[PDB]
Amino acid sequence: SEESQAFQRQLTALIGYDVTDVSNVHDDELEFTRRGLVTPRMAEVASRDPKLYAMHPWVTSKPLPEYLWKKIANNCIFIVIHRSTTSQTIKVSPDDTPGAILQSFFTKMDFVLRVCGRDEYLVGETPIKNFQWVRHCLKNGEEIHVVLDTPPDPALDEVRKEEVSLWDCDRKFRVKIRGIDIPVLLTVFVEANIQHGQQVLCQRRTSPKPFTEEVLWNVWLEFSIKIKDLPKGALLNLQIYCVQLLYYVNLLLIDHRFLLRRGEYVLHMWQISGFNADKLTSATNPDKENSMSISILLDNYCHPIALPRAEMPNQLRKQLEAIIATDPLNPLTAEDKELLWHFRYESLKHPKAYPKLFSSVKWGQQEIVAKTYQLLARREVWDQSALDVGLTMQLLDCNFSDENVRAIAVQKLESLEDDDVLHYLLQLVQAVKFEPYHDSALARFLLKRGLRNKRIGHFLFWFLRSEIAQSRHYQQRFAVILEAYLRGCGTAMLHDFTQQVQVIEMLQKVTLDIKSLSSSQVISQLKQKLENLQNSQLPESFRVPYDPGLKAGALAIEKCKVMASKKKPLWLEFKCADPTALSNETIGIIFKHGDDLRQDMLILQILRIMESIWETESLDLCLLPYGCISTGDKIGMIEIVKDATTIAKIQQSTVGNTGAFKDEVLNHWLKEKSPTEEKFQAAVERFVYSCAGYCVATFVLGIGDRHNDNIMITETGNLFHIDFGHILGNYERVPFVLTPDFLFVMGTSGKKTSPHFQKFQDICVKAYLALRHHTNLLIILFSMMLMTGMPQLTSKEDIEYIRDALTVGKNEEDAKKYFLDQIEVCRDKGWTVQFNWFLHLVLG
Ligand SMILES: Cc1nc(N)c2cccc(C(=O)Nc3cc[nH]n3)c2n1
């Protein structure tokens, strides 16, 4: 069909990479996964209620927090229903269904309740107190404005039609290293490794030969592992040294069909620069003219080789219990491993032991793996226990190459409601990088979830698209997942994603084109190019990628400008394209090149997770984790937090480009911007909370020592950090930033105390203690973040920072003292560090 031979060109420009291309593949695993995904996709489309899918209610089965209950007049929430112009207020109880909120308007004085100014529907059988939009209304002191209208037509979604034994040969596995060769450049040798989940099962090498643009060996490298002991997910890892590593490449020793890898191979190798997820890829370097390659041979006879509790002492029990207790990063000695293994059935009654128990497995032994599978059939406790995301994330990291282990963690995620899937989506997507195969329970889980809900589906799209555009190591695998998702979301979203891509691609060339001049001469062209695009180029509107609910209209040209950073970002403003928009505020997006916005994404995501850990304890630490979409390499968009200034600019205003930071200023600015002393005391309350929130979160993440220009505040007291790639993204110390100008708002002056400051410490202590209950979760997310998104900064010693910060092993009281001491390094230091940042960041 020419229709579905044009559709493929659409998907291709939507993905940013061509899936059908078969030039950089040495097998049919991708075709196999593309085909492989047809069933889970079609199963999901056929399974979704077309109406609830069309309206995508943003719901939560979580209890309504205290800070929102303690902000209720009397079991009464007010909604304002709009039509023509005619407003109308109804007396509604939190437990009121939105279906019954109409039987309180069609009788109390068919259709659907849509939020004013956004594509957000209050539909289905949920208590209204459970709609995400209702909770944010209660939080920010805002009236709930609904506009009655027609439900979208489900028919708008609708998708376009479609239609011997390895355990029987005891031979030592071997690889023939024919030789290497590099288009253009010493001593050089191949190192060959048989790996499984970062566990090296064997090591062999070749003889150091002279480094010539062509180096041959024709050697057979016999390993000490039997053909019959090779576990599925095992990688032949080939590497080149000289001693320093130069290039690597991997090859699954067992394919997607369970066949021992036989034949001839020429593999284009990945270069190094300057541990991480890129070193794990089964993908080869597409760049042929430049890459080093390697030629090998694997035995190829006949011959398809296919792959098919008692008592316990006391000091041992207590030794075992101490192992299960230890954090995810604490290492296991052979003694610990042999212990976990011997008492495996007793280790099975503790879900918390699974990562350590599965890590104590000798995967290079057929019989052992076989018994581990015996163990997996006795999974009742794991299956029954309450789902633990931190524990679940652990079995999906780089340390576990076995599909059956990985799949039990995916089985545990199936019971996550949409709300929670969004909290962990970015990291589940990054977790695909640790999958030995392109087709996994996780890749299908991501797919099943995207296809069932447009919010998860929208973000799943941008997340995959971000990776396809800047990761050559994982783009193929990611392009196959995106294509699977796009062939089932519906033509509605299909067309909708098309609008989005056109706009953002248009605005990126502009970003790059304006960047080419590093002035009044600049201010000129920017307004010229935005005049061009506004005609028959960018269509009427488009969804805001970081906020799927908002549709952005035309460019309010007058407000758009190039900003003053070494990298010249664009400050763009859009009219809301929705007439029902209660207001006339624009949509502010920053477009930039030079910031590894991938890093901000991972950080902002953990920031949303800490806001959620604080909710389990009725704490609102007022963080502003702004929308942020990475669109490629060192490029993307940033949501503009309205009514906000940089702390340094508030200083540069009444001291100006100096360092003579007056402790008086911030409080002057806050009073300057407050219309009443009522609003001033809220702007002070929001400050204490916001400051405490960032102080802890920042400290825990090891991004506490920040420059003055990289901390912002709203005219309403909300402080917040920015530019998360600018630190460990390109990196005397302060633990976090708690300067004298902040402290002066709180009431204190240098070495004193005030009510707000004690409130400050009591929030900080609570907040800091509240996260320590999720030590394991945070350690794993922090760990996964460094492997998948922090190029260079791994070491493992960078990871182990979080252990120290989270003061693991320490009891509560010892942990409260440690934090208060950290608040003291701040008190002691005052302006020392900020001053060095000016001395460093503004002058050298
Ligand atoms: C999040 C936010 N909001 C602003 N109002 C803003 C205003 C000026 C500059 C930046 C900014 O540079 N943010 C970032 C974040 C990552 N890179 N740059 C801003 N970021």
Swiss-Prot record:
Q: Which GO terms describe its cellular component?
A: cytoplasm; cytosol; membrane; phosphatidylinositol 3-kinase complex, class IA; phosphatidylinositol 3-kinase complex, class IB; plasma membrane
- All residue ranges annotated as the PI3K/PI4K catalytic domain in the record: 556-831
Where, by tissue, is this protein expressed?
Pancreas, skeletal muscle, liver and heart.
Q: Quick one: where's region Catalytic loop?
A: 702-710
List residues modified as Phosphothreonine: 775
Superkingdom of the source?
Answer: Eukaryota
Q: What is the effect of changing residue 592 to R?
A: Loss of kinase activity. Loss of autophosphorylation. Reduced inflammatory reactions but no alterations in cardiac contractility
Q: Which InterPro entries match?
A: ARM-type_fold, C2_domain_sf, Kinase-like_dom_sf, PI3/4_kinase_cat_dom, PI3/4_kinase_cat_sf, PI3/4_kinase_CS, PI3K-type_C2_dom, PI3K_ABD
Pathway membership, UniProt: Phospholipid metabolism; phosphatidylinositol phosphate biosynthesis
What happens on changing residue 706 to P? Answer: Abolishes protein and lipid kinase activity. Does not abolish interaction with GRK2
- Keyword match Calcium: no
Stated consequence of mutating residue 772 to P: In IMD97; loss of phosphatidylinositol-3,4-bisphosphate 5-kinase activity
Compartment list: Cytoplasm; Cell membrane
The regulatory note on its activity is:
Activated by both the alpha and the beta-gamma G proteins following stimulation of G protein-coupled receptors (GPCRs). Activation by GPCRs is assisted by the regulatory subunits (PIK3R5 or PIK3R6) leading to the translocation from the cytosol to the plasma membrane and to kinase activation. Inhibited by AS-604850 and AS-605240.
Residue ranges of region G-loop? 562-568
User: Residue ranges of the PIK helical domain?
Assistant: 309-488
UniProt-listed Pfam families: PI3_PI4_kinase, PI3K_C2, PI3K_rbd, PI3Ka, PIK3CG_ABD
Q: Which reaction does it catalyse?
A: a 1,2-diacyl-sn-glycero-3-phospho-(1D-myo-inositol) + ATP = a 1,2-diacyl-sn-glycero-3-phospho-(1D-myo-inositol-3-phosphate) + ADP + H(+); a 1,2-diacyl-sn-glycero-3-phospho-(1D-myo-inositol-4,5-bisphosphate) + ATP = a 1,2-diacyl-sn-glycero-3-phospho-(1D-myo-inositol-3,4,5-trisphosphate) + ADP + H(+); a 1,2-diacyl-sn-glycero-3-phospho-(1D-myo-inositol 4-phosphate) + ATP = a 1,2-diacyl-sn-glycero-3-phospho-(1D-myo-inositol-3,4-bisphosphate) + ADP + H(+); L-seryl-[protein] + ATP = O-phospho-L-seryl-[protein] + ADP + H(+)
Q: Where does ATP bind?
A: 588-597, 623-631, 720-728
- Coiled coil start-end: none
Q: Name one GO molecular function term.
A: 1-phosphatidylinositol-3-kinase activity
Q: Enzyme class, one word?
A: transferase
- Record note on quaternary structure: Heterodimer of a catalytic subunit PIK3CG and a PIK3R5 or PIK3R6 regulatory subunit. Interacts with GRK2 through the PIK helical domain. Interaction with GRK2 is required for targeting to agonist-occupied receptor. Interacts with PDE3B; regulates PDE3B activity and thereby cAMP levels in cells. Interacts with TPM2. Interacts with EPHA8; regulates integrin-mediated cell adhesion to substrate. Interacts with HRAS; the interaction is required for membrane recruitment and beta-gamma G protein dimer-dependent activation of the PI3K gamma complex PIK3CG:PIK3R6.
The family assignment reads: Belongs to the PI3/PI4-kinase family.
**Pathological condition linked to this protein in its record:** Immunodeficiency 97 with autoinflammation: An autosomal recessive disorder with variable features. Affected individuals have childhood-onset antibody defects, cytopenias, and T lymphocytic pneumonitis and colitis. Some patients may have features of hemophagocytic lymphohistiocytosis.
Q: What is this protein called?
A: Phosphatidylinositol 4,5-bisphosphate 3-kinase catalytic subunit gamma isoform
Give the species.
Answer: Homo sapiens (Human)
**Organism phylogeny:** Eukaryota, Metazoa, Chordata, Craniata, Vertebrata
